[PDB]
């Protein structure tokens, strides 16, 4: 082989470097150099990446999303729900777990909605997908490790998060329980995702514990590929077949 990681059929890989897919899409504060989003034909990811979820958590159907994204030769990041629309909620929260230069911060593409004043009005919002193409929407639920934490951040305790489309019908509630601390936090965030079709409407409703997307991703290419795990970087070369050790250019 060449020993080089090359563009495949003229289209480069997505180069995540030290970030995971969830880190990149959620906007881990440390993945802001990946916003170049060049058109890609495969995804290049370091094995056992570091810059994943800065706030400990899990991502549902993560493997299915990782598979989906290998086909997405290109995304347009679209500001679906501007964070300044939630005029009755605090949209300025964060965590020391995601801190930048010592100050609390958060995933860049999402809004941690917490209580304003003395309450948490039911948070609502929607989007009719008039962007011209199918969109990937990611959102999540915050699971406190205490009752005190639930009340301090959301006012209400018996809360739920409900999301749906013409095909999606999903409802969940927070799990408040003692957990081991990961990255300093006993709390966990759970992320979920869906694809909103054209002209369909996604409706969000919450009485607490909602992490709302600010941005979604428009998927416009629809091909097929995989994820290559390697510690190297892209070189200015081209191939027909690529392995983790470098590209292969043969007829055998």
């Amino acid at each position, epitope marked *: 082989h060449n020993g080089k990681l090359c563009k495949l059929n003229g289209i480069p890989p997505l180069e995540l470097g030290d970030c995971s897919i969830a880190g990149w899409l959620l906007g881990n504060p440390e993945c802001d150099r990946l916003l170049s989003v060049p058109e890609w034909s495969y995804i290049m990811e370091k094995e056992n990446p570091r810059d994943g979820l800065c*706030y400990p958590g899990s991502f549902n159907d993560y493997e299915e999303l990782k598979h989906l994204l290998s086909s997405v030769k290109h995304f347009e990041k679209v500001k679906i729900l501007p964070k300044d629309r939630w005029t009755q909620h*605090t949209t*300025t*929260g*964060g*965590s*020391r*777990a995601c801190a930048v230069s*010592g*100050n*609390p911060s*958060f995933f860049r593409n999402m809004v*941690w909605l*917490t*209580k*304003k*004043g*003395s309450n948490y009005p039911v948070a609502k919002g929607s989007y009719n997908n008039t962007s011209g193409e199918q969109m990937l929407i990611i959102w999540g639920v915050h699971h*406190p*490790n*205490d009752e*005190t*934490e639930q*009340r*301090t*951040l959301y006012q209400n305790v018996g809360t739920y998060v409900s999301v749906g489309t013409s095909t999606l019908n999903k409802r969940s509630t927070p799990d408040i329980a*003692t957990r081991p*601390k990961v990255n*300093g*936090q*006993g*709390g966990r965030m759970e992320f979920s995702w869906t694809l909103l079709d054209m002209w369909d409407t996604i409706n969000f409703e919450s009485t607490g514990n909602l992490i709302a997307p600010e941005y979604g991703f428009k998927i416009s290419k629809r091909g097929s590929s995989g994820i290559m795990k390697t510690e190297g970087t892209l070189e200015n070369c081209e191939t027909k077949c690529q392995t983790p050790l470098g590209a292969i250019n043969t007829t055998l």
Partner: antibody
Amino acid sequence: QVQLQESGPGLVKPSQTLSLTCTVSGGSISSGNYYWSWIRQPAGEELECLGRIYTTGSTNYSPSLKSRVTISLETSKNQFSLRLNSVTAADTAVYYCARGMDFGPTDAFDIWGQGTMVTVSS
Amino acid sequence: DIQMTQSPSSLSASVGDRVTITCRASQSVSSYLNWYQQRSGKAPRLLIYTVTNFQSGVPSRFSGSGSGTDFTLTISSLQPEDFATYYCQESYTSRLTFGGGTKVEIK
């Protein structure tokens, strides 16, 4: 309901070690997303953070104190303690035990103890 | 590190008066500003834990407002129970510093 109770008052000489122990009751010090700190208040002055210890054992100390102050966590007794080495007259103050809430969006001192007076003099 | 300023250093008021206390950050601290009520001889009590969000047990007369660098604590109608020194704290930075403290005096 969680309470923080400091050890009693006293007088120490310059170059001695200040030692205050906070007993936590109503729950475990290793239980939630909390941190403990000691806050000093010289009479007539502003509240000062001396330092913090996290439930996970991580610590942070203020620049004027870090070369002198140690804070530690004892899980088996639900206790925290403040050790200040090389005390001087300027360290005469009320020392409070406080429980901070480490919730991402909210960071505040929720529970305060009563405050123990420590005098440093010749 | 962010420097705090708080004013008036003191202000008197009658019972029933509207009272406002101003807290200013030298740099933005977003919404991470809390407030405390200290009675003389006692440890400080938390009133506001994030701007505008008050602690359970805190009378509804205590209403926070503001953002970034300029914040206000408003007592809608001063009570005999409120003659205290109020402090603001910026928890955005690693040093969780406090402002000077504003004394509310009896008129």
